[PDB]
Point group: D2
Chain length 308, copies 4
Amino acid sequence: PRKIILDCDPGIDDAVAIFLAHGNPEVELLAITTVVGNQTLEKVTRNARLVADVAGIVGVPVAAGCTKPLVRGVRSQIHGETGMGNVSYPPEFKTKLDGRHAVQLIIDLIMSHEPKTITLVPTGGLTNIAMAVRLEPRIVDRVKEVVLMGGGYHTGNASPVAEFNVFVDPEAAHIVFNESWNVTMVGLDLTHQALATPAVQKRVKEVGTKPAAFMLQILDFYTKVYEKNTYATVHDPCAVAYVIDPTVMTTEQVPVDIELNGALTTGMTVADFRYPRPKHCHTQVAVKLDFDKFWCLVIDALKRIGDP
Amino acid sequence: PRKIILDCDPGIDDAVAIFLAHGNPEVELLAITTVVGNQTLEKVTRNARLVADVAGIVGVPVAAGCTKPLVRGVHGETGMGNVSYPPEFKTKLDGRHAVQLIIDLIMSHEPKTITLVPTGGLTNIAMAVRLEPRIVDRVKEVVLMGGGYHTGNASPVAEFNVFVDPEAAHIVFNESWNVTMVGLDLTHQALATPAVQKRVKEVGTKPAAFMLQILDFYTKVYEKERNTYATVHDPCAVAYVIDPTVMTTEQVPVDIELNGALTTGMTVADFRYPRPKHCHTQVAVKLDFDKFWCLVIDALKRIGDP
Amino acid sequence: PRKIILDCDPGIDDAVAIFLAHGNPEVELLAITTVVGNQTLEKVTRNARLVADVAGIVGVPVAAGCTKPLVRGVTGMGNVSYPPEFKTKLDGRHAVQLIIDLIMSHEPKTITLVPTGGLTNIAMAVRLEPRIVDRVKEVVLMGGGYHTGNASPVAEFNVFVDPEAAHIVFNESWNVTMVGLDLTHQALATPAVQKRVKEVGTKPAAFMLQILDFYTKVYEKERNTYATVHDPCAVAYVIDPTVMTTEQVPVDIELNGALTTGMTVADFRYPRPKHCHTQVAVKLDFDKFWCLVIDALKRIGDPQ
Amino acid sequence: PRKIILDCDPGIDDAVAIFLAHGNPEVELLAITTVVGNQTLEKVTRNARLVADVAGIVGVPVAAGCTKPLVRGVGETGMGNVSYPPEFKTKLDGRHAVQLIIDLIMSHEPKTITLVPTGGLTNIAMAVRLEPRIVDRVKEVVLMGGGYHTGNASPVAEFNVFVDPEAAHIVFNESWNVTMVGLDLTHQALATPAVQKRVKEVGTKPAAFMLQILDFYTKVYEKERNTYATVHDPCAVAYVIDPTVMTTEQVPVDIELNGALTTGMTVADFRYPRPKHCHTQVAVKLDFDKFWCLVIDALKRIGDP
Ligand SMILES: [Ca+2]
Ligand SMILES: [Ca+2]
Ligand SMILES: [Ca+2]
Ligand SMILES: [Ca+2]
Ligand SMILES: [Ca+2]
Ligand SMILES: [Cl-]
Ligand SMILES: [Cl-]
C-alpha cells in the first residue's frame, strides 16, 4: 500500500477522506494530524477523534497541530459550530490523542521511514506542513510527494479567486508550493465535480452501517449548506482518491505560486497556463474527475469498513 | 451606424480593428486615438498613420495621446512589420492631444451616442474621465479589448492592455458606465487559420496583402507564445459593436488588481453565486467564429483598393 | 519676484499660504488652483474665492481642478459665512489646463509650482503635457513627512489622499522640495504669535485669527498641541530659502503597503547620491517664518 | 542574575553581545541559539562556537536553528579574518534551536526567562507557533532589530527584520512585552578610537578578537558610513543588564509585509493620543559612557579563559 499522512481539519469532507483512506487497501494511514481551519484546532481535533471512533481506526496516531495560521489572524457556515454538523458526540472517545504535536509527528514519521515512501495528503490549511518543512528541511527530499486538496486555478470560494484552505494560511501555502518536492493541487476546479447526488446518496445508504449512516447525516447537513445552489461537493477525499488511483483524474503540469500581497487576490493559487508549458515542473493541477470511479472508491471503502 | 472612437496602439491587431471599423457599414469612426504601451506612443502613432494611408481613411482625425502610463514605468522591423513607411504620410496628425479630442467629441455630440472602443492601455480613457467627469454619463458604453478573467499573456493572469497601466484600468472599470470586456478568454478563439488566411488573400487588394504581411511578421515574432495558429484580438471589440450576437457575454463584477506581487493587472471577475442582478460590467465568453471572420473579410472587400 | 502657481485645498492653512503669497513682494501669484482633498472640490473652491475676497486679490485667476483623486476613493470657512456673491469670479478653465497654459506661455524656468493639497492636478498636468516638466523652475510642495505622519502613523494627508499623484510628481526629473510634517510641525501658532496677528488690526488678520481659533480647538482636541500652520511654510521657502534647512536625499512614494501606503520614503543612508532632484525640509527658522507671515498681513493691510 | 536566551547570527555584533552576556554578573546565559541571516545557518553556527571557545563559555548549550527564513528567500576566513580551530572545544547541542527554546521556557518557572534575539526572528516565531504556551511564560523580549526612523537593508528596513518580515510580524503581534532596540538607538553605540584603545588595553584574547574582527568589517563596510564603526547587538543585552542604559518610549509597533518600498519596516505610531495599553516600546537614546563601560567591564571579568 501507499503510506500517507492525512493532515486535515474535520470538517465533513475531511471525515469522508478519513473514511476513504482507512477503508481502501491501497493506502495505509500512518497518522491523522489536525490543523486550525474554519473551526478551532480544539474542535477539529475532537471531530477527528469522533471520525476515528466511528470508523474504528486503531493503531493510527491522531495528533493535534497548529492552533493558529503562521501569520494571518484566525478565520462556521459550512461545517457547523461543532465542525461536524449536528452529530451527537460520545461521552468518551475510544481514540486517544497522541501526545506529540502534529508537526513533530510528521517529522518523526518521515525521518524514521525509508526515503520516498510517505505521501503527504493535506486537506486543511497548510500550516503544519510548512512548519515541518522549516523545522526539519530534510523532510522535503525524503517525502514521496504532496497531494493536497486546496486552491483553484480558475475558481474561488473564500474570495472570487481564492480557496479556503490556501486563504486561511497563504504564507504556509507559499512555503509548501515553493519547495522542490512534487505537488499535486486538487483544487476547486476538480472538486466541484465530486457531487453527492441523490443517486450517490442512496448508494451510500445501501451500505447500512454506522459509518455510512454517520456520513449521510453529516452529508445532508452539508447538503443543506450547499443548497443555501448545488449538491454537496465532497472535496477532500478527491486528494486521497488520487493517491489510490491517479487515473481517477486528469492533471496538467504547470507552474503554481501563491499570491501573498494583493488587495483582491491574496490566497490565489496562480497557475501559469501560458505557452510553452514546462516540460519539467514539480507542480501539477487536477482538471477532470472520473466521477464513476471516484464514487465507486468511496462506496467500496464504506463497505470494507463494515460496522466496527 | 454606431459612432465609435477607436483608441489603440497599432499593433497588427489594432490595424485589423481599424480596417473592420472603416470598412464595415454599421460603424462610423469618429477618431483614431493612440496610446503608449509596450511600444512607444511615437511608434504606434506612425503605425496608425500608415494604416490610415493604406485603408484610404480620410475625414477621421488621428490624434496622439499619452506618452506614458499614469503611474507605472515603461527589432529588425522596417516600418510596420517590414512594410516601409512612405516618405511622408498622407494622413496628417491632428493638433489636439487624444485626451482632449475624446472629451471634445463626447461633449459636442448628443448624449448616449458614442461608444468608446479602447484596444490599447486605458491611459487616455482614464485621463479623459478624470479631466472631464461629465463624459462618463454622456458615453453610450465602453467596449474594450483587454483583460482576461481566466487567461493571461503579460503574466499568468494579466493581459497586456491592463498590465501596462493597471491604474488606468482600475479607473475605467470602476466608473458607472457600462463596460464590455472582450478579454483573452474570447480573443483566443479568433484564430487566423490557414483557411481564413486564404480567404483574406483572395480578397486580392493592397489592404488585404498588408494585413497578411504584417500578421505573418508578428506570427513569427511571437511564435513562442502559441500552441496553435495566430489569433487577432482587437477587431473582436469592433465586431461586438457591429453585431453583438457575434459573441456571448456574462454580466459579472470585475475589478483590477493593483498591488499583487504575482497578480497586478489581473481583471478579477467574481463568478461566485449569487450573481448580482444588475452589473455594469460584462465579460465576453464565446465567439461566433464564422460570423467574426465573415465581417473582417467583408470589410476588406468593401474597402477595396483606395 | 518669483512667479508661482499656488495649488491648494483651502483649508485654513492654505488660506494663510494665500495671504503670504499675495502679501509678500518676493513672489508673484499667477493663479490659485484648487483640488479635492478632505473637503470636496466644490467646497474648497468656494473657500478659495472667499479667501481671495478677504485679501482683495484681483487679477489672479482662481480655477477649479480635479473633483476626484486619480485612483483612490475620497458654515463658509471654519465659522466665517460666505457672502451671497463672491467678488472673485471662478475662472472658466479647469485648473489642469490653466496650469499647462501658464507654463507653456511663459519663458522656461520662470514659474515655481507650490502645491499645498493633494497632488492630483499637478500629476494630471504632467501626464497630459509632459513638456511642462522641463519648463517648470521647480516644485515646492507642502506634503509628506520623512519621519512623521498624521493621516496614518507614517503618511501625511496631502500624499495619503492621492498617493499615485504624489508618485507621479516625485518621480519626474524636475527639482522637488518636500516641505513635510517634519518641518511644519515646528510652525507653531503660539499665544505670542496669535497676539502679534491680532495686533496687525486688519480685517484679514481677524479672519485668520477666527479661523485659526476654530483650528486650535481641533488641534488641542485631536493632537494635544498648539495649532501648526503647514501650507505657508512652502510659500515661505520660495520667498526666502534660508527660512529652513534642507537635505538632498532620494524620496519615493509607497503605493502598495498595508501599513505604509502614502508614506514619503526618504533614503538618508550613506553614500548619498551626487545628483538628487529631491530635497526635504528639516529645520524651521521660527522667528523669520512668523515675521514673514506678519509682514505680509501688514502689507495687505485692509485691502481695496 | 536575569536568565536570558540569546538567539543570534554571529556576526561580530553578536560576538560582542555574547561576550557582554557572559562577562556581566547581572545576566545568566541559558543558551546561545543561532539563525540564518546574511550568512548561512551553517556559517553563523561555526561562528557561534568560535565565539564560545574564545570566551571560554562552558555549560551553556549552543544550538543551531532555522536554515531558511519563514517565507522569503535568502579576505574572509572563518569569522572576519580569524580562522576556525581544527575542532571546536564547544559542542553543538543536538536539539534544534526552536526545541531548545521551547524546552527551556516550559521547564523553568514562568516569567523568569528573557529572550534576546539579535538576528532574524525565525526561531522565535517558529517556537511561538509550535508551542503557544511559551508566549505567556516568557518574561519579555528584548530584541536588537528594526528602526522606527532608520534603515540599513533598505531606506526604512533593518536587516534582522528585513531578512524575515513574516517572523518579525509574528513576534511583534504576540501579547508579550517587546523592547525593540533598533537602529535609532544602536547607531549611537560608536566604537570611537577612545573606546577601541580602552578595549585594546584590556589586553585579553577576547579583546584582541573583538578588535581584530571589528576592524576587518569596518574597512569592508565604510562607504555605507558617515562616521566610525558601530556595535549593535550588545545594546539589547545592555538593556537587560541595566535598563537605565537607554531611554524607551511605549508606542505601537507593527511590521510591513506587503510594501513595494517598505517591506520589513517596523512602523512605529508616535501620534497623539498615545494608546491606553502598549506591549511594545522602542529604545531612543543611549547612555554612551555607561554602555561602553559595561562592555569593557565584561571583557575584564572574562579575562583569558
Ligand atoms: Ca478540509
Ligand atoms: Ca492593441
Ligand atoms: Ca492644504
Ligand atoms: Ca554565563
Ligand atoms: Ca546579529
Ligand atoms: Cl524666477
Ligand atoms: Cl535628518
